[PDB]
Amino acid sequence: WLQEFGVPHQYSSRQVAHSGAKASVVDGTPLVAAPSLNATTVVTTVYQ
Amino acid sequence: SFQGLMELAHREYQAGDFEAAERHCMQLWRQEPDNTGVLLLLSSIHFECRRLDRSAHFSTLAIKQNPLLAEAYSNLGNVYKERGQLQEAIEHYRHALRLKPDFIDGYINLAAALVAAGDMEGAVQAYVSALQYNPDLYCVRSDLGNLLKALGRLEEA
């Protein structure tokens, strides 16, 4: 650190202690759906 | 009509109705119990109108007079199809298309019986034999297509 002498700030750069509050954060809830039928088939002569 | 080939009951079958045709064939088979295809008309009428066992009885009469007619077997197999005995229908369809090896509609009925039963490949041969007999029955070709798609062999379907 002494041989550094680059950014000493007397050990006391920013982020010095203080009376800080706390942040607040968000979130919600998702709903759901149900998919219906998708078939698409056809025949011609099913009777006898 | 009277004293002639009274195909008028056939005309009513084309109309799909029964009453006049039904009594007409009754009167036929006590005036011309000579043809049996008329009795087949009767069995057919009973078929669509859900007169099942009457169809069966008249078919059995058809079996008296000429047990060589594959089509009585065809109708018997149809009866079995809507009354469960599908295996007997299948062996009847053997019997029929042994009697008339170049008959188409028997192939169709037995293919329906097969797909009801669960053997696909036999039905494939049914349809294919139909086709090599007739390359023009496009409806049966589409039926082929539905079966093959049910087997997931997409591209050739």
From Swiss-Prot, chain A:
The record marks D27, G28 as: Cleavage. It comes from the Eukaryota. Proteolytically cleaved by caspase-3 during apoptosis. The fragments interact with each other; cleavage does not decrease enzyme activity. Ubiquitous. Shows highest expression in the brain, placenta and pancreas. Belongs to the glycosyl hydrolase 84 family. Monomer. Interacts with CLOCK. (Microbial infection) Interacts with human T-cell leukemia virus 1/HTLV-1 protein Tax; this interaction increases Tax interacting partner CREB1 O-GlcNAcylation. This is Protein O-GlcNAcase.
UniProtKB/Swiss-Prot annotation, chain B:
TPR repeats lie at residues 2-35, 70-103, 104-137. The modification Phosphoserine is found at S1. Highly expressed in pancreas and to a lesser extent in skeletal muscle, heart, brain and placenta. Present in trace amounts in lung and liver. It is found in: Nucleus; Cytoplasm. Ubiquitinated by the SCF(FBXO31) complex, leading to its proteasomal degradation. Belongs to the glycosyltransferase 41 family. O-GlcNAc transferase subfamily. It is linked to Regulation of OGT activity and altered O-GlcNAcylations are implicated in diabetes and Alzheimer disease. O-GlcNAcylation of AKT1 affects insulin signaling and, possibly diabetes. Reduced O-GlcNAcylations and resulting increased phosphorylations of MAPT/TAU are observed in Alzheimer disease (AD) brain cerebrum. The TPR repeat domain is required for substrate binding and oligomerization. Monomer; may exist in different oligomerization states in cells. Homotrimer, oligomerizes via TPR repeats 6 and 7. Trimerization is not necessary for activity in vitro, however it increases affinity for UDP-GlcNAc. Component of a THAP1/THAP3-HCFC1-OGT complex. Component of the NSL complex at least composed of MOF/KAT8, KANSL1, KANSL2, KANSL3, MCRS1, PHF20, OGT1/OGT, WDR5 and HCFC1. Found in a complex with KIF5B, RHOT1, RHOT2 and TRAK1. Found in a complex composed of at least SINHCAF, SIN3A, HDAC1, SAP30, RBBP4, OGT and TET1. Catalyzes the transfer of a single N-acetylglucosamine from UDP-GlcNAc to a serine or threonine residue in cytoplasmic and nuclear proteins resulting in their modification with a beta-linked N-acetylglucosamine (O-GlcNAc). Glycosylates a large and diverse number of proteins including histone H2B, AKT1, AMPK, ATG4B, CAPRIN1, EZH2, FNIP1, GSDMD, KRT7, LMNA, LMNB1, LMNB2, RPTOR, HOXA1, PFKL, KMT2E/MLL5, MAPT/TAU, TET2, RBL2, RET, NOD2 and HCFC1. Can regulate their cellular processes via cross-talk between glycosylation and phosphorylation or by affecting proteolytic processing. This is UDP-N-acetylglucosamine--peptide N-acetylglucosaminyltransferase 110 kDa subunit. It comes from Homo sapiens. The gene is OGT.
